[PDB]
Amino acid sequence: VNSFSGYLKLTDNVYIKNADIVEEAKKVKPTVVVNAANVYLKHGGGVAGALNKATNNAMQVESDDYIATNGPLKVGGSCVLSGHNLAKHCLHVVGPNVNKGEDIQLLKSAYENFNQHEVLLAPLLSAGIFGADPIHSLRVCVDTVRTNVYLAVFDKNLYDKLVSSFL
């Protein structure tokens, strides 16, 4: 039993809800919140900009030190950093950004990072301003993640469309 509330159950381990991931994280304070990151951990917009804003820029400060030490992530890769006031940990995961010409096949690799954590709150990777089809992202999530994932989906038209089209 966990404290996630109001989710629709899609499969044994995947759940989905129309929600602002920032507001969800503050309420639940999950062990792991997933950020829709880029390789530079520059949290400007989309989910990343919203999460970082909610941390009063502490996420960005921590991220800049991480990059200065370790260099950029790989597309499809991840790192674990602090969750600040939102979660115990933040798993920064880089899905491919179609508006940059990045290979969509890397979306499966990106979701594989979720399997290192028993329970996660997360957005749909490569959706939103990363330019991929959210229906496709949901399919890859369901077919790749085996741990318990709670998917937030801020946009309402996307959520109903995602629920109504799910196979």
Ligand SMILES: OCC1(Nc2ncnc3[nH]ccc23)CCC1
């Ligand atoms: O899930 C991916 C999508 N973006 C978000 N989801 C959940 N919470 C969010 N907060 C800010 C952006 C955001 C892209 C379409 C939904």
Ligand SMILES: [Cl-]
């Ligand atoms: Cl977005």
